[PDB]
Amino acid sequence: KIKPHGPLPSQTQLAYLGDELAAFIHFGPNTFYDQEWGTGQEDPERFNPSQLDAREWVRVLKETGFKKLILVVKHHDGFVLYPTAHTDYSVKVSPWRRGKGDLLLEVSQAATEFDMDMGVYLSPWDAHSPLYHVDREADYNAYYLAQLKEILSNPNYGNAGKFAEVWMNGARGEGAQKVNYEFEKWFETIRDLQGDCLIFSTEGTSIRWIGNQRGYAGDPLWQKVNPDKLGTEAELNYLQHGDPSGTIFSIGEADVSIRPGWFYHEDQDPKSLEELVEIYFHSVGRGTPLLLNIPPNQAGLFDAKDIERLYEFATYRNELYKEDLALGAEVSGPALSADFACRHLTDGLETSSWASDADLPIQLELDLGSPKTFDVIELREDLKLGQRIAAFHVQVEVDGVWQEFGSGHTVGYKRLLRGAVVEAQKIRVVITESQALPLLTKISLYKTP
């Protein structure tokens, strides 16, 4: 029994890491006003999608491999997209669904049908609320809290009444009131109603921002931080790389829009497959989830181009992973014991892993038995026992010379590392720095389609 190392992830954290792909939905007055930020002066009469179909949103997301859907139900403009008891600035005063509309309900019903996990984004900064003022901040905090209770206590909201993530955006306009939030109170309520539900915030919660909206996790990416170095003034590079000395397990979620903007704009186009693939390799392929925003249009529908792109992106990933070229390769090198043997890295069993207490560098060598053509290696740690590896490199034997394939810092939950396409039978993975005796659960090899 190897001892754990460092801060360990919760079950809900590991489940997210396992799921890899989440979808964001920004939709609201901003969609009708052709803007990215609203003022709270938007006319609810203009919130009037011609033919909204949340079931179609959920179906396409499910079919294209997304495992969670995070819905904006109140952006910075403050317009609430479910019939809240706590402000009149909501869908209640919109003509949509002859005034009886509830977008949270509509998305929740569809998500429940498709077993799509649910997140909810409720903007802390509220440009509409007359309570959003330093002189009224206790009242604003009670407003926000009361809405968390409305959202998170209702069996008709979420995936069968369950929410997997709450999103508290850190953004605030320069001229806005400097309201301070009752974070701990909010977190307690979230726990009371939804247990270990993940929380994205500027504070020391289970999810942090990766520090850009480009889909780029750093290398290294430590999925752990010290809460004392977070808050609204957290350094972006700290978010992006995490902390080798972090004290809490923290997922650096990589959010990015399929378009330039978060809301739908007719004049904008979605990213290319090539662009999404790069993002994929620098987010999921660096051990963190990708949260990809798809904005519905003024009809309440996903854009046709955007839909095509999600299917092409899904096809790409299915083809990448179709064959693990490393399965059954003979693996040699040091190993702690038979229970942690090298052959565990390519045996195709999720239940078996490798470890070694040998002095670094530790060299694992795979012999594929015959020459194969590949351009991706996948490594995974056992984060139930903590993140450990700080540096590694990969080589391939070509005409009797061990040439470089690639190098990196961290592995984490899952690390994809691309190299130039090669035909080779023998590969070395060399671990050169680690915070504790290294473990890997798998080595895989693929060819990009």
Ligand X SMILES: CC(=O)N[C@@H]1[C@@H](O[C@@H]2O[C@@H](C)[C@@H](O)[C@@H](O)[C@@H]2O)[C@H](O[C@@H]2O[C@H](CO)[C@H](O)[C@H](O)[C@H]2O)[C@@H](CO)O[C@@H]1O
Tell me whether residue 375 is annotated as binding: no
How many helices and strands, by DSSP H and E, does the chain display?
9, 18
Nearer to ligand X, 65 or 170 (CB): 170
Note whether 249 and 14 are within 8 A (CB).
no
**Smallest distance, Å, CB 230 to ligand X?**
10
Nearer to ligand X, 42 or 365 (CB): 42
**Smallest distance, Å, CB 51 to ligand X?**
25
Rounded to whole angstroms, the Cα distance separating 171 from 282 reads 24
Between the two ends of the chain, the Cα-to-Cα distance in Å is 40
**Smallest distance, Å, CB 255 to ligand X?**
5
* Angle, CA 242 vertex, CA 229 and CA 67 arms, to 5°: 115
**Smallest distance, Å, CB 334 to ligand X?**
43
Q: What H or E segment, with its residue span, contains residue 277?
A: helix 273-282
Nearer to ligand X, 84 or 169 (CB): 169
**Smallest distance, Å, CB 324 to ligand X?**
34
Note whether 292 and 303 are within 8 A (CB).
no
Nearer to ligand X, 96 or 262 (CB): 262
Note whether 306 and 270 are within 8 A (CB).
yes
Tell me whether residue 349 is annotated as binding: yes
The DSSP output letter for 7 is: P
- Closest to 412 measured CA to CA, from 442, 392, 382, 435: 382
Nearer to ligand X, 283 or 353 (CB): 283
Tell me whether residue 347 is annotated as binding: yes
Note whether 222 and 248 are within 8 A (CB).
no
Tell me whether residue 409 is annotated as binding: no
Query: Any alpha helices (H) in 283-328, and if so which ranges?
Result: 304-320
- Give the side-chain half-sphere CA count within 13 A for 322: 9
Nearer to ligand X, 60 or 70 (CB): 70
**Smallest distance, Å, CB 215 to ligand X?**
11
**Smallest distance, Å, CB 223 to ligand X?**
17
Q: Would you tell me how many other CB atoms lie within 10 Å of the CB of residue 297?
A: 19
Q: Would you tell me how many other CB atoms lie within 10 Å of the CB of residue 165?
A: 24
Nearer to ligand X, 202 or 395 (CB): 202
Nearer to ligand X, 108 or 202 (CB): 202
Q: Would you tell me how many other CB atoms lie within 10 Å of the CB of residue 408?
A: 19
Rounded to whole angstroms, the Cα distance separating 224 from 249 reads 4
Rounded to whole angstroms, the Cα distance separating 97 from 81 reads 12
The two three-digit tokens of residue 389, written as one number: 């590896």
Q: Using DSSP, state whether 14 is helix, strand or coil.
A: helix
The DSSP output letter for 69 is: E
**Smallest distance, Å, CB 282 to ligand X?**
16
Note whether 387 and 222 are within 8 A (CB).
yes
Rounded to whole angstroms, the Cα distance separating 4 from 12 reads 18
Nearer to ligand X, 124 or 285 (CB): 124
**Smallest distance, Å, CB 340 to ligand X?**
40
Residue whose CB is nearest to ligand X in the complex, by number: 170
Residue partners of 392: CB distance under 8 A and separation at least 6: 379, 407, 408, 409, 411, 429, 430, 431, 432
**Smallest distance, Å, CB 171 to ligand X?**
3
Question: In Å, what is the CA distance from 63 to each residue of 23, 56, 207?
Answer: 12, 10, 26
Q: Which residues bind ligand X (CB under 6 A)?
A: 36-37, 169-171, 202, 209, 213, 255, 262
Tell me whether residue 117 is annotated as binding: no
Nearer to ligand X, 28 or 300 (CB): 28
Note whether 80 and 90 are within 8 A (CB).
yes
Q: Which residues are annotated as a binding site for Ca(2+)?
A: 344, 347, 349, 352, 441
Q: Which residues are annotated as a binding site?
A: 344, 347, 349, 352, 441
